[PDB]
Amino acid sequence: RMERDTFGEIAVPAARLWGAQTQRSLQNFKISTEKQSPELIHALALIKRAAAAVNLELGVLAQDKANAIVAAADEIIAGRHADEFPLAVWQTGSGTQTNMNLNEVIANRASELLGGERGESRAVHPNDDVNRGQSSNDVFPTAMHIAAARAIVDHLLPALRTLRATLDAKAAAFADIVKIGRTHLQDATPLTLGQEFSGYVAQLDQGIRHVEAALPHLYELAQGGTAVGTGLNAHPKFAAGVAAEIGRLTGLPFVSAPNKFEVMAAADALVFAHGALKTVAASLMKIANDIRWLASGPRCGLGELSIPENEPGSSIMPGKVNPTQSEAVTMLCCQVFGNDVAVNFGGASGNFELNVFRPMIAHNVLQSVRLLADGAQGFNDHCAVGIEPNRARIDALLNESLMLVTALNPHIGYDKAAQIAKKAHKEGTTLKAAALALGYVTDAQFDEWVRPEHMVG
Amino acid sequence: RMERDTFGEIAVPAARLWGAQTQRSLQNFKISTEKQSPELIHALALIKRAAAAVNLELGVLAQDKANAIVAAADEIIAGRHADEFPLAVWQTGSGTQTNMNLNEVIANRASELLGGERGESRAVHPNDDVNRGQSSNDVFPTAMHIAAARAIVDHLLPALRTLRATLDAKAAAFADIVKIGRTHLQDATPLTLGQEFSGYVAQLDQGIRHVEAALPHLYELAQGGTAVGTGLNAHPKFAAGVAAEIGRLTGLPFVSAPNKFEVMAAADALVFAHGALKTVAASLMKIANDIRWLASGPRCGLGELSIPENEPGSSIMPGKVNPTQSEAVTMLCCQVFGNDVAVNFGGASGNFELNVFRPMIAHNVLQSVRLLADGAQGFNDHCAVGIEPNRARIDALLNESLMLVTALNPHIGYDKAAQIAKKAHKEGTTLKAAALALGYVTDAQFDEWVRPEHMVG
Amino acid sequence: RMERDTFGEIAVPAARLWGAQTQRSLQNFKISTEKQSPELIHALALIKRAAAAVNLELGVLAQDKANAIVAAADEIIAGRHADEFPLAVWQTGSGTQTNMNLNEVIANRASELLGGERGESRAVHPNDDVNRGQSSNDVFPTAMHIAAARAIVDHLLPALRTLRATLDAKAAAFADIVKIGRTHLQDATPLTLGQEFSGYVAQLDQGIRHVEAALPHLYELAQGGTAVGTGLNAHPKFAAGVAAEIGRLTGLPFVSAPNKFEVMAAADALVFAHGALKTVAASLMKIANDIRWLASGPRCGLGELSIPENEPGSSIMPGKVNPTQSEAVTMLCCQVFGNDVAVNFGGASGNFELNVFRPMIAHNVLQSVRLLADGAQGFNDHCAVGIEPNRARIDALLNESLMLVTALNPHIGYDKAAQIAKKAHKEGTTLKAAALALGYVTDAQFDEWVRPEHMVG
Amino acid sequence: RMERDTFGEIAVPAARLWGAQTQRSLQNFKISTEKQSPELIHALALIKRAAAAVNLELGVLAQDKANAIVAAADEIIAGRHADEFPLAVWQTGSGTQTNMNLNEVIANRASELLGGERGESRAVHPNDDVNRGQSSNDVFPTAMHIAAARAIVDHLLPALRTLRATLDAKAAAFADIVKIGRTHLQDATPLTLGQEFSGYVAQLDQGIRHVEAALPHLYELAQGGTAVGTGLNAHPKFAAGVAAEIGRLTGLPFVSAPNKFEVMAAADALVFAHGALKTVAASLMKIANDIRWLASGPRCGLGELSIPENEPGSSIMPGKVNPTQSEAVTMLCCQVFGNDVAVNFGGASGNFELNVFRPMIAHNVLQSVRLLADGAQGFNDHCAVGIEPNRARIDALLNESLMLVTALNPHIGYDKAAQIAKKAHKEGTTLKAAALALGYVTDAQFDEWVRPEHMVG
Ligand code: NA
Ligand code: NA
Ligand code: NA
Ligand code: NA
């Protein structure tokens, strides 16, 4: 069919629900392959849903149009129009082209829901009805905040809490397994496997609190600032009304931003939220790395842990288990670190009344949230829940090390203890063998005095 | 149908061409939505094509299988199997799961081409035939290098050369337009609009040479290193043969890497290539920014340039032209900067015989190439070719500035010249008006002595 | 003099207060020129001061030694031993060499304070007295947290609050100055200069709250974890005692870390704090940029603001004022963004019981704090306090723009309003001139209907 | 004494050689503690030396002044005026304040060398003589290029070549030591220790070539572009003359930049050079990491290598050797990655005729060069030259692994080989023990058939 905009008319495939402007600009920006995320499209649709409800309640929009717009927005949110959003991330820096994409798709679909047709005859107008009371300039920042906040609360925090619960159950189960510490990669003072795991659990607790610290600023919505922040041409109740309705729809305490200029001229809440995300990435990197190192072998590595084997091995290559989950996590943590830089450059580069690096900022923040959430969940399900200690190997490393010699200090003094360690080292023997050789400690004394289970605090 | 691997059997949709391992691991890594790029899948298929040809020539693979494998690989390369590669970037760090995806799809399709069926009855074996003489460990590094090099030569360099040609044609056309320089954002010494544009052209020339400097290392292929770099179990002629065949297929001087350990244990060629890409990003950022600033207005900005209007305006809002191409470019340049960090962290994090951050490294490098290439092309087509000078505005800024006062220095000395500038500034007048007021310069003298066209070198 | 360690003896200049190990390792790490910051050295000295007091109170350290150690630590904190800390940042990753530097300097100086001598005869032992109850492994993380927290509270937050107060006083003063908005760099809807400034103020408020959100984790101290986190060989009251004493000394609510493993195996609090710092950097970049752009000229820029001239101009080059403070700030904001990446790579790279990227992490975090604090203060003092509006220029841009045409919409309808704007644009005239020409609006009507002061909400 | 500038007079300590402007602006920029590097100050002095010589040769500068300026510049270059350059990096973005610092110090010192005095009576004028024919705008870019190029050629490349030679001598010495490979951290196919080391050597060769690829653009000098690139007010022979003289002084092929606008409006050569530097950082990270991992223990790590012990150990803690050199290198590699981001943001942020992020860009590039050069040298001297293989441990890991089972494939087939590996794994025995138990291979057959020395290509 032919759709129309202020430049004229243009053919749009009958099967598609977008209009003139989307079609026109689907030719101006063949840049790469990244498109707006479903999360972001859904957040935009939620704003359109909320605006229709509020505009109905205020008496400025007819009920039939309002209801059809709400129903169309709900279909988008339910995932039923996956193919109607074809535009690139690399577009207008305000996200205008994508705002128009929502307006046109919702107008065409709402028109069908009213018994009408797609295209120039439609009863619902993209700008005058779907976009009523809004500007591209205040809609897109609003959608960024909503998309990021909901992804954090509904996807990331629960995944982190699940992994935390698992590692804490493992910590409890491993509380009595004494192992050799490693500092600088070198044999060190003992601790329990449970204590080491309790570190990971605490890192997750800290990360969860840091991420939560990003929410209050994200909850502040630009909607109602209109073109430049002043609220010119907005209905006086729209800002508060839309924010309350978004709150009702999401279950989260969204509020109208106390300073519209700040949340339009800048995307600082996304910069800060991403700072929290890269803190989680640093923790997950460490956790994932420790686990793959501790499970390395089966015979020329550390060998302290066994992990589940996800993908089929060789039969000739037992018990070679590649730590695929740790590799996926460590890779995505690198991606989060890169994404932070892209967000930072964009966030820093606002000019005057509007930051126009927005589609890129949103693309990165939402990707980072998905990566960390799915990564934590997958690592939980396919690795962490099945971690097992190799108890004999752990205990052999512990007792064949040189590190337990400090237990002898009270009983024979530092110098003789040091003398035994040096001799075991030089000769390739156990501490016990060297201690017996020097005549400094009987077999029975060694066993009574050298108790790893008493050396862990 | 039921397909089988060493863990057992698993259902695969009849409509799909992949096998047991792809299907199995399409459930282990539901991480986010990023999949391997077509560029990378094509480079992998090219290796399989080359291996089949070489293995035929060496006499180790039957002609019928070889021909069917080549034909299947060609179909993948022609874009006919877009839906047969469903795996995430966030997978095995070696890219093994994706190597298996190629082997299985090509085996199933080659089997059809031989008159056979998909699945367990197939005549072509994914590992024993499609993967003959190869390891996942040496295939994936090879494909990274090929994908990056071809994308650079076939996509990025031509786009950069096109933009360079356009800006140089503009430089020539604007060679006699004298304008006010700006340093620190402040009014400064004059230059021509052509000279300013010649800067952009030179930045593109420099960038093209820097990017070309990344090619020789990318041309070095790991193929033939097998599991750990030694070439154990490779046919002795395979490494050289495959590299020559990849050379023939691509038209580029690919060679067998002189040190297999280096191109397997590290992805340093990709790290370096991405260093070149972020240099281009810094240049494009500057170019894109200057152009949008110089075109800012229509009345409260700089106003020196007009740019084409891509997307329909308002009718009420002439001549407001949002610089959409500059916004797309500046955003993607931010993305390239982030991508560099992700590449760097991954590149730095190899252990012993294999770097296993590879799918992430490849994802970023290939994205950056696409962004810069399509970005440069779009900026060319939709902005640069239609840049026009606002000649009256440029000349008004020039002659109403305070900067031309230095022309008077030889004729009345520094102090009187400085005296005129200070008076024009204080009084809000032209230099000429102040010069006449002080009685230091006649009207006729001003016009004879103050010649911007002689102040540009 | 000759000082001694377990490798033997080594000459130390008589004029210096350090000992064998510092001297020895002042030759092993001639890497570049960066040394530990005074902030970090002071935080280390504070720990030694606190340990001495606590160890005295517990009865394990003699009063004379305790008092001399406290007095020596105080001298370091007062800045009296600036030349006694010669080691590089690029040292042991645990900061051990620097811990030893504190122990040796304090031992030698305390020995002098007791009537003794520097060197091998000293009454105070670096390890057995100054380092009593401590490990390098738990001291350095403790000092990182203290140094970062105090620098945030005592240096950065007050500087940010001072700049915020100034910009808010400016906002109030400029509340009635109506100006042209700019979105995408293009002329847009009006707002007041005060409203625009209120955006900056709100960004600072947000940043201050985000930075404060980093403090609780920084307040958690590793001290008492000893070698690997377990607290082996620590006096049972030392951890709580030292944290309380650091609290008393600083006025801040430092506490013993609930999980020692987490704050030793990782530096995640510093990663998060730096995430807050780079959020402030993104805001300051925007603020500093807007101000220099708005002050650009004097005649070929935007020209809306005048800023103080710090450094002497030319006399021939009035009124060229280079925005030096904005340049310093924008440059240091770039540095903060880089520093974040270095912190992130280090933070992510802990192994097992100890993260050994610590001197580098600390160097970056503390540099970023200093840069942002001194930058905000300097920008306040030398730029922000003296910002003045160029009222005639602002009002001329406003009224000579095309943007005020929307005021006519209610009185003559959109189409005629749009018609006037298009004609002014095409002809190079004011809106009023075009409106009179078309006979759509009288002079008196224009003035009554087009009221910028009513178009700002 | 009192010195004077266009704002008036100001006290300068009699002991210091700088003048009014340096003193004045030593109060405007108390930002943090970073000052211009000696490398950069020396490069600036070299330009002043070259300008004096050229200006003498052209007849525009008196011989006595020229000679005194040259002599003063030489003293600065010889390191004799370390305390005369007190300004911060965080200054004018053009580096003007630092250009003035050189002009004033050289003028005052040259005046002394002519029999005159420091201060207002001086015979040599900072601007009119020391800065003759130059602008701050073209001097600073010139000095950045010189400083970076010389640091690369004279400091970094030789250090990299020294480390490369050492690791290649080690590779040769270890060519017959067969060891277990590791991929994904897991036991893998064998290779020689020499082959593994040859990887590191090849990474260094590649890095050296990549760094060399940055030199031609760095050799292009802005000097002669004057204020905005046009060369207005430059002597027509100055650009070529100064570049030739800098070439003569340094031994390097410096040339006048073919496009002055490009090397003034942008610092793209520094962006690219830093891209090369971060490639070297990725390689050094890997090398340094592998070595510390391979030397980890003495008993609960990998244990394949011994490294020199730099700093004194414990006596009680043999043979615990912390890998301090690897820690210093890995930390500084993180710093280089961060520095790249700061350089990139600055490089991307030029406006119109001048990039004014220059002191920050230079600070980072020159720091990265020093870190990598001193890091490589220190790692060479204090680690690499003394690396020794633990031959018994290497051979025990090899022969007690499961990996050698593939040697049996030709002699008993895959299935029986796989059967032996599975049994050794399950039972905790050697492959030989399991092979004998199953009756599949005699003792004599095992030794004849399983030859690690034939499994390395
Ligand atoms: Na003793
Ligand atoms: Na004069
Ligand atoms: Na109308
Ligand atoms: Na068999």
Coordinates of N, CA, C and O in Angstrom, one line a residue, chain C residues 224-258:
Chain C
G224 N 42.6 -7.4 60.0 CA 42.3 -8.5 60.9 C 42.1 -9.8 60.1 O 42.0 -10.9 60.7
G225 N 42.0 -9.8 58.8 CA 41.9 -11.0 57.9 C 43.2 -11.8 57.9 O 43.3 -12.9 57.4
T226 N 44.3 -11.1 58.2 CA 45.7 -11.6 58.1 C 46.0 -12.1 56.7 O 45.6 -11.5 55.8
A227 N 46.7 -13.3 56.6 CA 47.2 -13.7 55.3 C 46.2 -14.0 54.2 O 46.4 -13.6 53.0
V228 N 45.1 -14.7 54.6 CA 44.2 -15.1 53.6 C 42.7 -14.9 53.9 O 41.9 -15.3 53.1
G229 N 42.5 -14.2 54.9 CA 41.1 -13.8 55.3 C 40.6 -14.4 56.6 O 39.6 -14.0 57.1
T230 N 41.2 -15.5 57.0 CA 40.7 -16.3 58.2 C 41.0 -15.6 59.5 O 40.3 -16.0 60.5
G231 N 41.9 -14.7 59.6 CA 42.3 -14.0 60.9 C 43.3 -14.9 61.7 O 43.5 -14.5 62.8
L232 N 43.8 -15.9 61.1 CA 44.8 -16.7 61.8 C 46.0 -15.9 62.3 O 46.5 -15.0 61.5
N233 N 46.3 -16.0 63.6 CA 47.4 -15.3 64.2 C 47.1 -13.9 64.6 O 48.0 -13.2 65.1
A234 N 45.9 -13.4 64.4 CA 45.5 -12.1 64.8 C 45.0 -12.2 66.3 O 44.4 -13.2 66.7
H235 N 45.3 -11.2 67.1 CA 44.7 -11.1 68.4 C 43.2 -11.0 68.1 O 42.7 -10.3 67.2
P236 N 42.4 -11.7 68.9 CA 40.9 -11.8 68.6 C 40.2 -10.5 68.7 O 39.1 -10.4 68.1
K237 N 40.7 -9.5 69.4 CA 40.1 -8.2 69.5 C 40.6 -7.1 68.5 O 40.2 -6.0 68.4
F238 N 41.7 -7.5 67.7 CA 42.4 -6.5 66.9 C 41.5 -6.0 65.8 O 41.5 -4.7 65.6
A239 N 40.8 -6.8 65.1 CA 40.0 -6.4 63.9 C 39.0 -5.3 64.3 O 39.0 -4.2 63.6
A240 N 38.2 -5.6 65.3 CA 37.2 -4.6 65.8 C 37.8 -3.4 66.4 O 37.4 -2.3 66.1
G241 N 38.9 -3.6 67.1 CA 39.6 -2.5 67.8 C 40.2 -1.5 66.8 O 40.0 -0.3 66.9
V242 N 40.9 -2.0 65.8 CA 41.5 -1.2 64.8 C 40.5 -0.4 64.0 O 40.6 0.8 63.7
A243 N 39.4 -1.1 63.6 CA 38.3 -0.4 62.8 C 37.7 0.7 63.7 O 37.5 1.8 63.1
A244 N 37.4 0.5 64.9 CA 36.9 1.5 65.8 C 37.8 2.7 65.9 O 37.4 3.9 66.0
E245 N 39.1 2.4 66.1 CA 40.1 3.4 66.2 C 40.3 4.3 64.9 O 40.5 5.5 65.0
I246 N 40.2 3.6 63.8 CA 40.3 4.3 62.5 C 39.0 5.2 62.4 O 39.1 6.4 62.0
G247 N 37.9 4.7 62.8 CA 36.7 5.5 62.9 C 36.8 6.7 63.8 O 36.4 7.8 63.4
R248 N 37.4 6.6 65.0 CA 37.6 7.7 65.9 C 38.6 8.7 65.2 O 38.3 9.9 65.3
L249 N 39.6 8.2 64.6 CA 40.6 9.1 64.0 C 40.1 9.9 62.9 O 40.5 11.1 62.7
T250 N 39.2 9.4 62.1 CA 38.7 10.0 60.8 C 37.4 10.7 60.9 O 37.1 11.5 60.1
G251 N 36.6 10.3 61.9 CA 35.2 10.8 62.1 C 34.3 10.1 61.2 O 33.1 10.5 61.1
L252 N 34.7 9.0 60.5 CA 33.8 8.3 59.6 C 33.5 6.9 60.2 O 34.2 6.3 60.9
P253 N 32.3 6.4 59.8 CA 31.9 5.1 60.4 C 32.5 3.8 59.7 O 31.9 2.9 59.2
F254 N 33.9 3.8 59.8 CA 34.6 2.6 59.4 C 34.2 1.4 60.3 O 33.9 1.5 61.5
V255 N 34.1 0.2 59.7 CA 33.7 -1.0 60.4 C 34.6 -2.2 59.9 O 35.1 -2.1 58.8
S256 N 34.7 -3.2 60.7 CA 35.4 -4.4 60.3 C 34.5 -5.1 59.2 O 33.3 -5.3 59.4
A257 N 35.1 -5.5 58.1 CA 34.4 -6.1 57.0 C 33.7 -7.4 57.5 O 34.4 -8.2 58.1
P258 N 32.4 -7.5 57.2 CA 31.7 -8.7 57.6 C 32.3 -10.0 56.9 O 32.2 -11.1 57.4

